From Swiss-Prot, chains A, B, C, D, E, F:
Homodimer; the homodimer further multimerizes as homohexamers or homopentamers. Interacts with host NUP98. Interacts with host PPIA/CYPA; this interaction stabilizes the capsid. Interacts with host NUP153. Interacts with host PDZD8; this interaction stabilizes the capsid. Interacts with host TRIM5; this interaction destabilizes the capsid. Interacts with host CPSF6. Interacts with host NONO; the interaction is weak. The chain holds residues 133 to 351 of 500 of the full protein. It comes from the Viruses. Phosphorylated possibly by host MAPK1; this phosphorylation is necessary for Pin1-mediated virion uncoating. Forms the conical core that encapsulates the genomic RNA-nucleocapsid complex in the virion. Most core are conical, with only 7% tubular. The core is constituted by capsid protein hexamer subunits. The core is disassembled soon after virion entry. The capsid promotes immune invasion by cloaking viral DNA from CGAS detection. Host restriction factors such as TRIM5-alpha or TRIMCyp bind retroviral capsids and cause premature capsid disassembly, leading to blocks in reverse transcription. Capsid restriction by TRIM5 is one of the factors which restricts HIV-1 to the human species. This is Capsid protein p24. It comes from Human immunodeficiency virus type 1 group M subtype B (isolate NY5). The gene is gag.
Length: 205, 205, 205, 205, 205, 205
C-alpha cells in the first residue's frame, strides 16, 4: 500500500503477511457471504492496483467468481476509456487507461506516481470501486435463498427468524410481518403502523 | 484510526488485520454479552466513522441486532440535525450533519478534516457514543434471564450464585439476600444492615 | 497507555488488541490464582485510568469478584478525598478527586494532562495501586485451601508437597516440617535449625 | 528486503519470521497450485536475490520441482550473460552477471549496491522474474487434469462445474458450453453468441 | 526493558505481551530443563529489575523452585551489601543496595537512573546474573537421572544413547565409552585415544 | 542483532520472541533436515555471536549434535588463532580471538564494537560461517539413506521417485536414470543424452 511515514510523506509499503493471510482465510471461511466485502475494503486500505490484484490472485478457489469479476472489471475499464481518452513527453507522467487502473498495463512505479501526484489520481481507490461492484454482483448471485422463502417456523423464536430475514436481505441487496408465523403475526398486526423493529422483537419475545 | 506519529502530528492510519479479526472473533464468541461493549470501545480507539462502520459491517451474524442498531443511529443522527442545523465556500470545511457523523454521506478526507481541525469536531467519538447507546439496548434485549429469577440453589455455593446474580444485573442494566437460599439467608440476616459484599460472601462460604 | 515516542515526548497510545486479548485470556485460564496479579500489572504498564477500566470491564465472568473490586476502589477513592480535598480557572488544570483517579468522572484528556504534567500527578499508577489492593483481597478469598491442611501424603514426593505448600501460602498471603510425612519429618529434624529449603529438599529427595 | 526508512532512504531490512513462515506454510498447504505464485511474489516484495534464495531454500519437500527451477534459472542467467557481457576499478561497482543476479556469486553488499544505485540495477526484480518463469512451468507440469476432461456431471451444479473448469484452465495456462451436461447445454445454446459468464451461470442455476 | 529509540537515546519500554506469554509458556512446557535458562536470558534482554521480577512472578507453578530462587537472590544481595556498603543529597542519585538491585526496595525510576547513568550501574544485568545462578541450582536439583545411570541399551542406537548422555550431563552440569553397550564398546576401544565424537558416532552407526 | 535505525545508524536490538520461537519450533519439527540450515541463516540475520549462542543454546533436544557442533566450532576457532595471532591500550579496541568470535570470551559490548567499527570486523558473520559448517556435517551424518538405495518402485510415480532422489542427494551433499524402474528407464534411454529433468519428468509422466 501507500502510507504516510513518521515524517508525513506518502511512500510505498509492502503488503504484509498478516494482510495476505487475513484475506485468503476470510474467503476460505466465509466464501461470498456479504460481510466479506467490508473486510476486503478494510484489508485493502491504501492499496495500489498491484496490491488489489495480489489479494484477488491469492484466492485459490471460486474461479467461476474470479472470472466473473474480471468481466465486470473489463466493463468498468472500457467505460473509463470512453470518458477519459488518452493521446509521451520525456520524464513526464502519462494519463492512465482502464487497464492501467486495473494494474494490468501499469507498473508499480507508475501507480505510485499517480497516487502520490499533486493533484493525485487515486488509481487504487478507482480500481477498488470497480472490484467491489463486481464482488456485490457475485454476493447477490451466490445468495442461496429468496427473501420470499424466509418464513417464521411454527416454534421458531422471532429473533432467529429476523436474523435469517435480514441475513438474506443483505445478500439479495411489511414483508417481515407477512412472513411471520400466525401467533406473532397477530401480535405484530395489533401494534399498528410505524412500529420499530425493537418494538416488534420485544412484542414477539 | 487517527493517531499521533513519531513527531506528534495527527495522521490517519489503516485499521489493522489484528483489530479487524479481534472484533469479528469476540462477536462470534460472546454475541451481545455485556463485556463485548468495553471491548468494542477499546478496539475502536481513535476510530473514524469509516472505521466504526467497517467494524459493524464485518459482523456476519446477528442481522436483527445490526438493523436495530441502524434505527438507533438514525434516531441519534436526526436529533443531532435538530440541534445542529446547517446552511459551501471554496476550499473551506463544511459543517457535519447526522449522516456525516455516521459515515454515510461523508468521505474519509472530510472525517479526517473534522477530527484534526483546531478546534476539532470529534466525529469518531460522537458516532461511537451513538453506536454504544444502540449496543446497550441490544445487550438488554438479549439478556436471557430476569434478575427476579436468579435465586440460589439448595446446595449452590454462594459465590456461584452471586456470579450469576451480578452477571444478569450487568446485562439488564436487599434482593441478593432475598434470593439467597434458606441457610445463607439466615446467616446474611444475622449480619445486619450495611454489610459489604465481601463480608456477605465470607459469611456464606 | 502513555509512552515515550521516538523523539522522547510523552504521548497517548491506544491499548493494543494483543494487550486486550492477553488479559481476557489469562483471567479465563487462571481465574484469581495469585500469579494473575503480576500479569495484570505488567499488561497495564503505562496505563491510564481509562485503560485500567477497559481491562477490568472486558472480563465477562467473575462478577461477584468485580463487584467486590468496585467496593475496594470506592473505599480507596473516599480515603483519597479525605486526604486531598478540592475547591475552575479558564484553561487551567483542576485537581483530581477519587472518582477522577478511578476514571469514572474524568475524561481521557484530563487523565493525559495529569499524567504528563510537570510535576506529574500519576493517576494511572495511583489507581492501579487501588485495583491491586482489591485483587489481592479476592485472591485471598478465593484461595481454596488453608495452609494448615497442606500435609505431605505417605508416598507423595517432597518436591510435590513443597510446591502445594508454597502455592497455598502465596494465595493466603517450622510448619513445612510439621506438615511433612513421618519419614521426611525424621530426616528434616535431624538437619537441625537454620537449614535452607534447598538443603531440606535435597535431604528428603 | 530493501525498504524505505522513516526518513525516505533505501536500506536493507532482515527477512522476518512472519515472511519466512508464511512462505513455507503455503507451499506445504497448496504445493504448486497456481495461486501460490501470486503469494510468492507478494511475500518477496522488495527482496534481494539472497532473500529469494532463502525463500526457495527453506522449502523442504518437492526437490524435483526445486531442481527444475534451478535449470530454468540457469537458462535465464545464461541468456542474461549473452545479452550483457562484462569485462575492476578500486572502490567501484562491477557489472552483474547471471549468477550475480541469481545470488550465487554476489554478496549481500553487492546486491544492495546494485539495487540502491542511481540509476538502480534492480537485481531482486530481475531474479524474481526468472524464478516466476520457472514456477509457472512447474504449475503447468503438476496440473493433474486436462481441460478436455473437465465435463459437467449429470446432476453437478453448473457453478461447481465452472469452478472446476477455470481452476484447471488457470493451472494449464465455446469449450465451457461443449463440456456442459445435456440440460444446461440446451439452455446455453438458446442464449446465443456473446453471452457473459454471469448470464450463462444465471441461466443454468 | 531499556532500549535505544530511533534517535539513539536510552529509554524505558513496557514489557510486551509477546515476551510475557513466551516466558510463561516455556516454563509450562519445559519446567526446569536446562535450555529454559538461555531462553530466560534472551527474553529478559535489556530488562530492568522490575521486568525480571515480573517474569519470575508471572510463573504459577513450581513454588518450591521460586522460594529456593528467593533464597539464592537474598544470599547474592547480602554479599553485594558486604562488598558495596552505602552511607541523601537533594536531587542526587543514591547508591544501590542488594535489595535495590533485586527490585524489592527500588522504584522503576531509580532503576532507570542507575541503568542510564554515565557511567552506568547495570542493575538489570547484575540481578539477572543472580537469578541465573539460582536457576542453574534448580536445574541441577531437578535433574532426574545421574550420568552414571545413562547406559546404552542392547539394541539402542548409539545416536539415541549419546543424546540421552549429553542431555543428562547438561542438567547435572571415557565415561561415554564405558557406558556404551558391548558391541559399540568394542568398536570404540578399537579407535584408540583422541577420537572425536563425530568419529565415535560414525563408527557405531 | 545489529540493525540500522530510522536515521541509518548501526545499533543493537534485542532478539525477538518471534525469532526465538521460530528457531526452536523448526528444530523440533524438522530436526536436521537440510532445509533447517537456510532457515537458521535467515533467522540469524544481523546476529551477534551472543545471538547465535542463544539460538543454539535454546535447543533442548539433539545434544549429541550440539556437542559435535562445539567440536567443529573449536576447530574453526583454533584455525582462526593460527592465522590471526594477538599480542591493551586504555580505551582501545582489542583484536578478537577464536573464542571471542564464538562469543565465549567476549562481551556483547565488544561484539558490538567489532561489528560496528570502521572498518568493521564482522564477528557475527564469521561465527555463523563456522556454525553452518558444523550444521552441514550433522545434516550429512543424520541423512538416513544413501543415494544408491533410492530406486523407483514398480508402480511409484516418477515425480515421487525424483522427489525422494533429490531429497536424499541434498542431505548427502546418469544415476537418476539407472535407479529408475524398467518402464521409465526404457523411456529415458530413448531420449538420448542432454535431456533436461523437465523433459525426463514429462516423458515418464
Amino acid at each position: 500500500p501507500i502510507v504516510q511515514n513518521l515524517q508525513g510523506q506518502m511512500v510505498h509499503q509492502c503488503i504484509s503477511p498478516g494482510t495476505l493471510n487475513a484475506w485468503v482465510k476470510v474467503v476460505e471461511e466465509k466464501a461470498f457471504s456479504p460481510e466479506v466485502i467490508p473486510m476486503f475494503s478494510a484489508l485493502s486500505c491504501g492499496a495500489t492496483p498491484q496490491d488489489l490484484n495480489t489479494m484477488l490472485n491469492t484466492v485459490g478457489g471460486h474461479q467461476a467468481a474470479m472470472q466473473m469479476l474480471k468481466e465486470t472489471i473489463n466493463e468498468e475499464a472500457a467505460e473509463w476509456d470512453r470518458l477519459h481518452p488518452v493521446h509521451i513527453a520525456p520524464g513526464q507522467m502519462r494519463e492512465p487507461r482502464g487497464s492501467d487502473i486495473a494494474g494490468t498495463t501499469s507498473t508499480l512505479q507508475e501507480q505510485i506516481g499517480w497516487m502520490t501526484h499533486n493533484p493525485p489520481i487515486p488509481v487504487g481507490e478507482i480500481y477498488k470501486r470497480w472490484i467491489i461492484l463486481g464482488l456485490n454482483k457475485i454476493v447477490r448471485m451466490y445468495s442461496p435463498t429468496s427473501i420470499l422463502d424466509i418464513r417464521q417456523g411454527p416454534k421458531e423464536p422471532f429473533r432467529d427468524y429476523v436474523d435469517r430475514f435480514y441475513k438474506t436481505l443483505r445478500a439479495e441487496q411489511t414483508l417481515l410481518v407477512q412472513n411471520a408465523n400466525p401467533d406473532c403475526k397477530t401480535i405484530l398486526k395489533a401494534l399498528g403502523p410505524g412500529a420499530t423493529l425493537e418494538e416488534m422483537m420485544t412484542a414477539c419475545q
